[PDB]
Amino acid sequence: MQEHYQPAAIEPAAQKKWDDARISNVSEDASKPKYYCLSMFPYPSGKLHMGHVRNYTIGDVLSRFKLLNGFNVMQPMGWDAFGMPAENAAMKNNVAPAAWTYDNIEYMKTQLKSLGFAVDWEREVATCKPEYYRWEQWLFTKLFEKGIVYRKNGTVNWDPVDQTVLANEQVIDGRGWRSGALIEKREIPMYYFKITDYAEELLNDLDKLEHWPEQVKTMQRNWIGKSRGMTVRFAVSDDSKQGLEGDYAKFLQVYTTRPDTLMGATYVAVAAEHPLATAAAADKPELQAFIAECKAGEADMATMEKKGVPTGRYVVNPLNGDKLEVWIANYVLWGYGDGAVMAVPAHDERDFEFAAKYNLPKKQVIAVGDNAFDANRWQEWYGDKENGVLVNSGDLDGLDFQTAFDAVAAKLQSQGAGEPKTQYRLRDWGISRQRYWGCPIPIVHCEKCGNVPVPADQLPVVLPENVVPDGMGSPLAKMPEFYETSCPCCGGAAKRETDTMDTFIESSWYFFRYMSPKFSDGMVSAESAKYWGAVDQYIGGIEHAILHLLYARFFTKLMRDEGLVNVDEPFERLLTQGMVVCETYYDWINPADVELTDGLPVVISGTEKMSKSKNNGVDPQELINAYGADTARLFMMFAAPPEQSLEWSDSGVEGAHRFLRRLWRTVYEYLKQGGAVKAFAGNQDGLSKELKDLRHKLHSTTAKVSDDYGRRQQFNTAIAAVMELLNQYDKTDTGSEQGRAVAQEVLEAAVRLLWPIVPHICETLWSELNGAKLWEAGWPTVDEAALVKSEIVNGKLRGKITVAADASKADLEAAALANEIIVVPGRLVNIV
């Protein structure tokens, strides 16, 4: 054995060994229990970041842990290759997004390989490849025919100068990011997934995810935003009919989730586009100007100032006769149902602020205990939906929320003035992107037949990769060699859709493609979907906790309903790794290039998440080059729990390295002192106290690491536990024949316990210790016998009893009360 730890030498040799044994290239082996461990696949945007490495090391520790326990582990990787990063790289550097993408894939994959993750590179996918996206085109066509995907006009932000559709992330104060020109709102036909048809399924199925973080489930519940409420109609008054036609002449309709407060309404509010708004804004230009301000302006709703103007029109509350004025209010949106709401200032906080601004009335209709009500100050309990009881509500006084709900539902229904209704904040999923580098939408536009889907055997619609976009509209709409085609229905001349898909589509089903990424007759082969089932463990950042996860669960249910898979939920367990943060320097300098206290130094600034913004993300390549993959993986698993933020630390990197030198040194000095022997096993009576204690430390450590890997998923404490065993080992004379056998038992366990964290050094040290295959020896066992510890009358002594080392004060006093009560354990039990 070489005396000194050389990671730059041991690490490539170990990866070659693993690659040559194909331990990570798995099949659908029915003679082994499957384990599907998945880390969120990256955008190939150039080079791996330190955050990447943390995410993917975590996935690797869990995959390697399951593999040592005999599982058939699939840990796939791949490239979420479509989207804007490549388009800007095309604009900025005069190159095709495809070739820029494959260049990045090559570099990053080599980076990922050098970290030694146990990945099935035979299941790699690149989502920008026709091989992949043809199947999401296929699914699009099948759902389009069912109406699950549909086409209708939607609003986009048009920049008149750049001549391109803008996302709201690029419209700043109403103007184009790279232009400042005033943005126009234009109607254009776009494609949508009817995700609202699955809202109830997507909500209730969260209850099945017992192994998801509760906050992630809460974020999804709040996004779907289900509410059970009441449709309520207020008959338009006799004096307020001018210009009103149809049903709008008859009643103002409203959705409320608090119909138990209907007797406390003091006004109503309609959107600027509501017919009662535009009808009262005829002889009243003051309202015409407010209506103008509104369509000029959920994201900003909380932050914005709530404004309204009176209307002079009136409606009648169907429950208590009251005639209440309508208002036009900027907070009422035209499209979220009725476009009109009631207002109960005494029990809704926004209605309170609105009514306090304009001095509008507020009427208590709910009291909570003896809580004092004061109309001039809002208190949290005004909105209490659980401990309130109805006040000033005549026939409803004394009821609680649900009974009043059911009562007003019965009253309104019996008078025809309302009915219960379920609403959702969830909107349909808009697919269309007016950009180049993304999956083409498989629709052909024909003047006779309409918009028609591309037949299955004509898929894929191939995206031309010989394209350099220039931010002046999508190049596809200027490429007749792409959009000119024939109609698949009638054969006449026709045009391809030139919009591309939301790149969330690719990441909504890639976990299924991984099961059979060369299947050519469908999204995923039946045989593979049956074997792998669902992802047992998913690891990714919290920024994807809402949209990506909801889209992925939605696609899972769509694919199941198509008979392609037989699971309801894609991800069983979910782990959210914390960010990696790092000091900043300064414009801004990368930390690997600084005068750490060119010539005059820089300013040591603040610590924040590694990013391009402040140029503070350390290249994991400089870290691998300088210390090796195992030091990188060890540092990140040791510094903090995986969920906590990780602070970049030079001394922490050094400390991980020195610990690996120590592990190396410990094994060498053991084999220097007499070579390998058979590890201690079996009954341990006759072993010395010192060796019994070391074996106790050993098997306690195996139990704790197994729990930390398996149940708690806290790897930093697992490493600390293995450090304590080594410290104990260092304080133990293991020179005797029995001592050498226990020493071999300790080092053989420690090397396997750490193998998921630092597999290169542990693989190398293991083969110096033992001649078997490490993955066939498997995860260390807990020897329960090693955990059992040895056993330890009014004055004059009268007997003696054998006690368990874990016997409580009640057991000493019990055994004392049985031999032929003050108790000092280990010494005497004295019965007065």
Ligand SMILES: CC(C)C[C@H](N)C(=O)NS(=O)(=O)OC[C@H]1O[C@@H](n2ccc(=O)[nH]c2=O)[C@H](O)[C@@H]1O
């Ligand atoms: C499933 C897809 C929608 C994922 C998508 N390709 C993506 O986020 N791609 S990504 O490449 O941006 O990130 C891939 C994963 O790596 C983590 N990561 C990445 C960079 C960093 O600085 N910090 C950090 O933690 C990040 O949370 C995520 O889980």
Ligand SMILES: [Mg+2]
């Ligand atoms: Mg269950």
Ligand SMILES: [Zn+2]
């Ligand atoms: Zn046609």
